[PDB]
Design a protein. Structure first.
Ligand SMILES: Nc1nc(Oc2cccc(CC(=O)O)c2)c2nc[nH]c2n1
Length: 291
């Protein structure tokens, strides 16, 4: 039972707590209602600022509810996430024109958030939401900074999309962490398999190294001074993208390689990525959603 909502139904266990599908009692609309699993006043103010952000490729934060010493976030509900859509599309693959549309849209949403000095820090297929009109939207922008290195979830957290600087213990987040994650998601849409499905912080880092080569001071000045860098890390040579994401074409592989540079400073920006030749013929196809 809830004092302001009716027909509350659990969607799943989110990064910050349980997420419900809920029907506002006054208005009848259906929203995603996120109960933050506390044991953070600064976290109200900061998240409340995110109510002001509005872009077609960002899931709207409708409200921040602090009542009865509980904290809830209210977002615009969408019917499917990209993880479920990829699973539903596994036999055929997501068509290339739709992969390209979704990547383009996701870059537009990141470029918007980054221009407003908001990072995600934890993009993953389970917080990318899709609708029947061919849109894809990013949920939970800005929450990690406002929450913050900290775990609020009971589920196994996924590491598969974490940038290598994070895994190497750098406590300084930049826009580049979101480009990395999106590159990993791009590769997963194309190949129908996760790019780096690590089961721990070291297995994640070693999966990256075995594909991209062990980083060194030549490709990543400063890497050998990251907090968790060890000189004893095996030295793997780097494989070619052509083996990693076939049959993605020359344009897609070039863009992906720029999204996956080791040095965050060298990683393409969202804005620059939107100008890449890969998007010359981008379109907005209609997806086949089974709800
Ligand atoms: N249907 C739906 N689901 C959402 O988030 C979930 C719901 C459950 C789990 C996760 C995964 C995670 O948090 O790791 C995200 C929404 N956010 C805004 N609108 C939303 N609509």
């Amino acid at each position: 039972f809830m004092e302001n909502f009716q027909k509350v139904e659990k969607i799943g266990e989110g990064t910050y707590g349980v997420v419900y599908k809920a029907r506002n009692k006054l208005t009848g609309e259906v929203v995603a209602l996120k109960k933050i699993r506390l044991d953070p006043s600064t976290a109200i103010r900061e998240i409340s600022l995110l109510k002001e952000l509005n872009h077609p490729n960002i899931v709207k934060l409708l409200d921040v509810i602090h009542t009865e010493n509980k904290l809830y976030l209210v977002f615009e509900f969408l019917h499917q996430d990209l993880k479920k859509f990829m699973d539903a599309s596994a036999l055929t693959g997501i068509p290339l024109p739709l992969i390209k549309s979704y990547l383009f849209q996701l870059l537009q949403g990141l470029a918007f958030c980054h221009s407003h000095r908001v990072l995600h820090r934890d993009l993953k297929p389970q917080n990318l939401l899709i609708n029947t009109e061919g849109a894809i939207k990013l949920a939970d922008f800005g929450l990690a900074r406002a929450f913050g290195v900290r775990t609020y979830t009971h589920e196994v957290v996924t590491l598969w999309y974490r940038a290598p600087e994070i895994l190497l213990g750098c406590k300084y987040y930049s826009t580049a962490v979101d480009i990395w994650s999106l590159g990993c998601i791009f590769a997963e849409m194309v190949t129908r398999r996760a790019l780096f499905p690590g089961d721990s912080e070291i297995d994640q880092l070693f999966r990256i190294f075995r594909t991209l080569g062990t980083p060194d001071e030549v490709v990543w000045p400063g890497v050998t001074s990251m907090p968790d860098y060890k000189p004893s890390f095996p030295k793997w040579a780097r494989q070619d993208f052509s083996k990693v994401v076939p049959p993605l074409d020359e344009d897609g592989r070039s863009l992906l390689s720029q999204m996956l540079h080791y040095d965050p400073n060298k990683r393409i920006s969202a804005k620059a990525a939107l100008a890449h030749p890969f998007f010359q013929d981008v379109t907005k196809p209609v997806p086949h959603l089974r709800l």
